[PDB]
Symmetry: none
Subunit: 444 residues, 2 copies
């Protein structure tokens, strides 16, 4: 039952904005447009609950002039997506809030904006879908290093629960946790790539370039006889999301040791990397799914000779196939999860395998794994395990600062997890239909 939906993990104790009546207009704000949101989330507003009432199109050029002020700012410019070049892209900074809930009753969408949570505590964000924050990268040749658009970034914050949300493609990260942010739980959420339908977000981006190839040199090269990718090939390869969760963004900073995050009952569908990528702190994932089936299929479209031609011109275009990554003395435990078609599911050092300073600790327990039709269920520790950490000499697993995790939690069997998380009442926004006061609660 509904206790399956309880707050668990490192965000334990977070009550957000509390249980507040919708009639308490001073502290419960119903948001219908960008101006309402700007007024509600203005620093020191004192607002405790923000109810998003409908989809919000929050790009810098489409919002009312009254909304073009803190907490909204113009983000880095859209350079390539025909829609985003019109709408613009905003960055909305939630700063200094202590005890805040942002939710919608029926899975409203947040489009064309990044959210940054800074210097805040006890923030709950639930039942929202995040979309239309990706575009093709010409400027940095496939590296996605310019726009810096991420759906949610947490900085120097404490106690954050993101739950029953859905995230689509992003130029950079989906949910990143930085600058010592502690007490994060992300649960019951869907992270997915583009599905390649004929009017998909990615297809719309590619169709624009196909009609004007000379204006997009990387795209033009990929389509040219030097490489030989079809437009359909490029849509398929571009469908998967390049980056999941960056937990600790700067190398060898001691504030990273304070990062803590729990991921559970989430689906990561065609996410190429960072589930999570950790530096220094403590991350626990249980009952998650990393299903990279479509990304793995897309990789079949790039042969070795094509890959050589792509890289020979300095372009990055292809499929990364990573799962969980622990670096820089971090601790990651994955348990009772399902991993499909991820080639390197368990990584312990990204920077220099013979420099132990860059190695993290990582362990996987009772997890189902499949690669190209293989079948394994077990741990990272048994001889020959396909979940063994690579590539550095292994640092024996232990948490950082405690012997056992400081919370209890309920575990499902991984063999039935895919059915549960992909059901009509599974992970994501707009799946759970109950009275809206339930979105303010943290246990059932």
């Amino acid at each position: 039952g509904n206790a399956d939906y309880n707050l668990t993990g490192f965000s334990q104790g977070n009550t957000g904005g509390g249980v507040i009546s919708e009639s308490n207009t001073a502290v419960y704000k119903k948001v219908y447009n960008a101006t309402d949101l700007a007024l509600a989330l203005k620093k020191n507003s004192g607002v405790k609950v923000v109810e998003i009432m409908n989809d919000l199109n929050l790009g810098w050029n489409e919002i009312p002039s009254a909304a073009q002020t803190s907490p909204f700012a113009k983000h880095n410019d859209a350079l390539t997506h025909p829609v985003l070049k019109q709408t613009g892209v905003s960055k909305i900074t939630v700063d200094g809030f202590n005890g805040l809930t942002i939710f919608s009753a029926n899975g409203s969408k947040i489009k064309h904006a990044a959210i940054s949570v800074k210097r805040s505590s006890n923030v709950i964000i639930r039942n929202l879908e995040f979309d239309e924050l990706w575009e093709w990268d010409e400027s940095t040749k496939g590296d996605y290093d310019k726009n810096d658009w991420d759906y949610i970034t947490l900085e120097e914050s404490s106690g954050v629960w993101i739950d029953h949300c859905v995230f689509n493609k992003a130029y950079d990260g989906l949910v990143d946790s930085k600058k010592g942010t502690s007490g994060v739980t992300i649960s019951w959420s869907t992270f997915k790539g583009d599905d390649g339908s004929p009017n998909s977000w990615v297809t719309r981006q590619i169709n624009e370039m196909e009609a004007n190839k000379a204006s997009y040199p990387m795209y033009n090269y990929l389509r040219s006889s030097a490489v030989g990718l079809s437009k359909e090939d490029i849509i398929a390869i571009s469908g998967s999301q390049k980056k999941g969760h960056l937990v600790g963004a700067t190398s060898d900073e001691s504030a990273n040791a304070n990062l803590s995050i729990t991921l559970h009952h989430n689906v990561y569908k065609d996410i190429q990397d960072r589930m999570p990528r950790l530096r220094g702190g403590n991350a626990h994932a249980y009952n998650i799914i990393m299903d990279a089936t479509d990304a793995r299929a897309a990789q079949t479209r790039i042969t070795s000779g094509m890959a050589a031609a792509i890289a020979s011109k300095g372009y990055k275009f292809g499929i990364t196939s990573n799962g969980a990554i622990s670096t820089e003395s971090n601790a990651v435990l994955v348990e009772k999860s399902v991993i499909k078609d991820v080639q390197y599911p368990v990584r312990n050092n990204q920077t220099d395998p013979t420099n132990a300073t860059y190695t993290g600790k990582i362990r996987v327990a009772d997890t189902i794994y499949s690669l190209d039709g293989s079948s394994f269920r077990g741990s990272r520790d048994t001889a020959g395990s396909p979940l063994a950490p690579v590539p550095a000499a292994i640092k024996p697993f232990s948490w950082n600062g405690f012997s056992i995790l400081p919370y209890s939690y309920q575990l499902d069997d991984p063999s039935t997890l895919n059915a549960r998380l992909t059901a009509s009442n599974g992970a994501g926004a707009g799946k759970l239909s109950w009275s809206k006061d339930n979105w303010l609660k943290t246990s059932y």
Copy 2:
């Protein structure tokens, strides 16, 4: 002016155990004896603040039986000091801590024990004096290569602030940083030798040998007609501390590139060497004093013919006169400091001056220097400077991995620095008397 006491430098971002009330007994431990310390510093104890309440005598043979267990272990045996042969010497290993402050309210002493910090992050150590961890070396003939007793060793750790501490003689090093440890600041601290008073620690060691000369072949040789040193001469020459800070202990290890350390507002009185000695990484010293006046005086007791007689028998006994040393592609900047009676204040290659791989980068900016009554104020780099790096071909200075230091800081003028640091509210333990909660803070 309490902001003068702010945490700065590479340990920025370290908050230690945080602000915790002394009434919060689960995580704030008052330590009166070795057993209390052993319980508080046991791996995974979860303790955040350790308040040392009084001087601690922590030798392996003097502590309670209940304290003879991890995190305490027996160190290498005392072979020569009459006191240490009775008390024994312990090694206390702080392992796996994240966010820990160890302090005392009034400058309590830690005696007869080495502290090793391993695999830890965000550690603060303040207002403690470290003493009685030196003895005469017969076994390695003056090399001090056997006992391996150091007051503090940091290994594979991140974020360490040592501040308002005092260090006396040690067999080996005072504070060493190893195995890729980064984010270290040492500030407002005193490092001093023995003062040669009639019951000083060094005098007690020499008196024991004077009464039993045949049992100490090196001491006996030095006193013999082959050399002609008096007991008083040997006490004076032994008074200075041989080694300061070893930052990177193994030649050409890739983890050395990750070492970072800031030294500031410290006094190094009669320290012969290693202020700091760096391999590979980055070290910044500002507003420090290296005052080797008494060591320089002691050197006058060894004439050329005496020195030749000492060396001819394979003994090392004398006065090294080094300051800051950068090796193996490391970067050391010293600025706004005072250096007195150090003959070789700036060194760039200890292992083989004809091999550039062993040369480090080093620069000194606006520093006051005096040798045998001379007077200079200036930099490393100007013609005829007595602060020029020796002895290898000079590598142009630059930091490793960054262009400018990743932190901001205020510089005092070196002309008033000696007065400031040797004042009643100057560097060292037992010097600041403010309410004890101030020892937990990192800014003022």
